[PDB]
Amino acid sequence: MMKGSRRTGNNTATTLNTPVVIHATQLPQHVSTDEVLQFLESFIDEKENTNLSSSISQLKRIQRDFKGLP
């Protein structure tokens, strides 16, 4: 039925949207709050010189989280 076509749109994962394989190449090495806050200051600055605005809006809450206070 129609829901058999909506889950083609609910998945919507082609080989243009998604990578084919993802493999971690080393072990996950932890970071510090001084390195997270240094990264988010640079990642948000890079994208703000579309999509992604709904995501960055969730990162600015975390940038407000590691240093500031609601």
Partner: protein, 100 residues
């Protein structure tokens, strides 16, 4: 994680041993009529998906006649990888080959 790092490292080493360097390559310096029929095929197939075109197309609507105009001006940014039958290969840019 270690089993992939030691797996990519094999693959980029195997493909390094099979790359013939540009001074050791000893195949024909001409474009061998199948390379020509596939460069023009692949370049015309990229142009129709809105790739940037490096020629003043004068109202030409056929994508294949556009790519035949770029091959005449040596503006095609492709590379032929000529396989030798062990798996080793030679890279030949389209700019340096000779068109019959």
């Amino acid at each position: 994680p270690e089993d992939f790092q030691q797996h990519e490292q094999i693959r980029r080493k195997t493909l390094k041993e099979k790359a013939i360097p540009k001074d050791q390559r000893a195949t024909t310096p001409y474009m061998t009529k199948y390379e020509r029929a596939r460069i023009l095929g692949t370049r015309a197939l990229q142009i129709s998906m809105n790739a940037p075109v490096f020629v003043d197309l004068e109202g030409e609507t056929d994508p294949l006649r556009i790519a035949m105009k770029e091959l005449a001006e040596k503006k095609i940014p492709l590379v032929i990888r000529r396989y030798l039958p062990d798996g080793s290969f030679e890279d030949w840019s389209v700019e340096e080959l000779i068109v019959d």
